[PDB]
Design an enzyme around this catalytic site. Structure first.
Site, mmCIF file in Angstrom:
data_model
loop_
_atom_site.group_PDB
_atom_site.id
_atom_site.type_symbol
_atom_site.label_atom_id
_atom_site.label_comp_id
_atom_site.label_asym_id
_atom_site.label_seq_id
_atom_site.Cartn_x
_atom_site.Cartn_y
_atom_site.Cartn_z
ATOM 1 C CG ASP A 132 -7.064 7.094 17.840
ATOM 2 O OD1 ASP A 132 -7.331 8.005 18.279
ATOM 3 O OD2 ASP A 132 -6.336 6.804 16.758
ATOM 4 C CB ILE A 175 3.388 11.835 12.260
ATOM 5 C CG1 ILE A 175 2.534 10.882 11.774
ATOM 6 C CG2 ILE A 175 3.497 12.425 10.478
ATOM 7 C CD1 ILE A 175 0.536 11.171 11.160
ATOM 8 C CB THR A 176 7.060 15.570 14.622
ATOM 9 O OG1 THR A 176 6.433 15.131 15.983
ATOM 10 C CG2 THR A 176 6.183 16.012 13.932
ATOM 11 C CG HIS A 215 -7.489 12.290 15.127
ATOM 12 N ND1 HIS A 215 -7.029 11.234 15.538
ATOM 13 C CD2 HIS A 215 -8.740 13.031 15.888
ATOM 14 C CE1 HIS A 215 -7.533 11.028 17.013
ATOM 15 N NE2 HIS A 215 -8.344 12.163 17.761
#
Ligand SMILES: Cc1cc2nc3c(=O)[nH]c(=O)nc-3n(C[C@H](O)[C@H](O)[C@H](O)COP(=O)(O)OP(=O)(O)OC[C@H]3O[C@@H](n4cnc5c(N)ncnc54)[C@H](O)[C@@H]3O)c2cc1C
Ligand SMILES: NC(=O)c1ccc[n+]([C@@H]2O[C@H](COP(=O)([O-])OP(=O)(O)OC[C@H]3O[C@@H](n4cnc5c(N)ncnc54)[C@H](OP(=O)(O)O)[C@@H]3O)[C@@H](O)[C@H]2O)c1
EC number: 1.18.1.6
Length: 455
Positions: free
Chosen positions: A154, A371-372, A50
């Protein structure tokens, strides 16, 4: 000139420093980190397949190159310097140290070889120095993962991707090697509730469904009453429940049924089961299976909980990956801490009863969010801090900042890593990857890292 510092250099620390520098023209900001290099989970957590998620590093690099920002790598707060010492040297301190543990399974057999947490497994392929000797045994043919969130997807995905596709990413050479020799051919992702309650999201569910060389295994009967219990749902979730539903009750095509036909690897989702005990191989040397308890759902809406029927199901496998969440730990016992929620107690970022002390990120709100989400909540902490500043509620007197902390580091013989020093390490990582065509080959030995810098 106001003096401020942040504890931890992942997204909460850096987004908190960017807000302070932009809205206060003279303030100075120092960032402290225990690892020798910056960026946190953007480097040691986001999967190597990613690369586009890691582009926020460019905005972090711009923040760090400013003349009122400085980085101090290789410093473990609460060990090398205490939180009280930083509180005395700066006008304000921001705790942004994330969540360094994993929630434990807490069952008989968990300690058997072949059992690991997802977080130790992710650190292994992502290059986190403390796990460089994990050596997972990939010679079994079945793997069981417990819990159903994005983290669970993942590790299932790195376990099943054809090794050549991982070739040119930044994964470790050692982890790449081991995946080439793996016999894992079947992966199961086991959840205690049902489909309606999964924690992963749609971009991630869809990459799994389309993973070259594999095929999906969903059972039709777990999916009853789905398409009806989702009339009132909002765009996000309903879309997700229809991708799961399509994939599980609709006929492929002539091509897609044939891709599923020749695939050497397979993955599946299991519902209504809860981890009861890891079964030992005849002589006890390793894991041979997992004993799950059958469960039933009782309750309404979000709030539904899983209860046991009395029955059980034994599932054979040689690899158990526990992926039921991360968790924060107390940093310095002088600092408040709530062991139930796993956070530093606070009110919009102000630590409860501790003037001058603030918080950002996972340690402020719990270990969930992308993250945002971490970004904008950090902007909130920075606004509250600058308003406390302007109104006169922080020490109204001159403060030394790094001039004082650096004297203690020297005396205790701690060598801090600067940002220019990271620029060097960064460059060595880039040239080491040049021959194999990777973006970089990560340095994994701290001692060697310090040597390349001149100590
Ligand atoms: C495996 C995984 C994959 C993810 N993938 C994605 C994704 O693909 N997309 C997405 O948007 N989000 C993803 N996330 C979520 C994202 O990682 C978090 O939203 C974000 O990193 C939280 O930032 P943070 O600053 O709070 O903490 P972290 O990133 O953990 O940073 C905390 C920092 O503090 C340092 N530190 C810890 N203790 C100390 C101490 N005592 N002294 C000094 N420094 C210390 C740590 O070493 C680290 O550098 C993922 C998370 C995980 C676990
Ligand atoms: N691409 C991305 O956006 C991305 C990628 C990777 C990670 N992240 C994020 O990073 C954060 C961390 O994720 P995460 O996967 O580890 O956790 P998560 O999203 O909260 O999922 C945890 C899972 O473990 C389960 N569970 C909890 N305790 C259990 C127990 N004792 N036994 C069995 N099951 C148990 C939960 O089941 P229950 O639901 O019933 O309780 C749930 O399936 C999330 O916010 C994730 O979205 C984001």
């Amino acid at each position: 000139t106001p003096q401020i510092c942040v504890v931890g250099s992942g997204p909460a620390g850096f987004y908190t420093a960017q807000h302070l520098l932009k809205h206060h023209s003279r303030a100075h900001v120092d960032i402290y980190e225990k690892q020798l290099v910056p960026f946190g989970l953007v480097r040691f957590g986001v999967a190597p397949d990613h690369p586009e998620v890691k582009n926020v590093i460019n905005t972090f690099t711009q923040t760090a190159r400013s003349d009122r920002c400085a980085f101090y790598g290789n410093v473990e707060v609460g060990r090398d310097v205490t939180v009280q010492e930083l509180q005395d040297a700066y006008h304000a301190v921001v705790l942004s140290y994330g969540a360094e543990d994993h929630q434990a399974l807490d069952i008989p057999g968990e300690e058997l070889p072949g059992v690991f947490s997802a977080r130790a497994f992710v650190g292994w392929y992502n290059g986190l120095p403390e796990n460089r000797e994990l050596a997972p045994d990939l010679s079994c043919d079945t793997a069981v993962i417990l819990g159903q969130g994005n983290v669970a997807l993942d590790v299932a995905r790195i376990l099943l991707t054809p090794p050549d596709h991982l070739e040119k990413t930044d994964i470790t050479e050692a982890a790449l090697g081991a995946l080439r020799q793996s016999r894992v051919k079947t992966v199961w992702i086991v959840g205690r509730r049902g489909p309606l309650q999964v924690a992963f999201t749609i971009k991630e569910l869809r990459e799994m469904i389309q993973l070259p060389g594999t095929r999906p295994m969903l059972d039709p009967a777990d999916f009853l009453g789905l398409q009806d219990r989702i009339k009132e749902a909002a765009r996000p979730r309903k879309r997700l429940m229809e991708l799961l539903l399509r994939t599980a009750t609709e006929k492929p095509g002539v091509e897609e049924a044939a891709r599923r036909a020749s695939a050497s690897r397979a993955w599946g989702l299991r519902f209504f089961r809860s981890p009861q005990q890891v079964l030992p191989s005849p002589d006890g040397r390793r894991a041979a299976g997992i004993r799950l308890a059958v469960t039933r759902l009782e309750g309404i809406g979000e709030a539904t909980r899983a209860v046991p029927t009395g029955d059980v199901e034994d599932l054979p496998c040689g690899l158990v990956l526990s992926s039921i969440g991360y968790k924060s730990r107390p940093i310095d016992p002088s600092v408040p801490f709530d062991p139930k929620l796993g956070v530093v107690p606070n009110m919009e970022g102000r630590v409860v009863d501790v003037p001058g002390l603030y918080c950002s990120g996972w340690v402020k709100r719990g270990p969930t969010g992308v993250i945002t989400t971490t970004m904008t909540d950090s902007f909130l902490t920075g606004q509250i801090l600058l308003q406390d500043l302007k109104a006169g509620h922080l020490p109204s007197g001159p403060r030394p900042g790094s001039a004082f902390i650096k004297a203690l580091l020297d005396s205790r013989g701690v060598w801090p890593v600067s940002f220019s020093d990271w620029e060097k390490l960064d460059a060595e990582e880039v040239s080491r990857g040049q021959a194999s065509g990777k973006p970089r080959e990560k340095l994994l030995d701290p001692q060697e890292m310090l040597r390349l810098l001149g100590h």
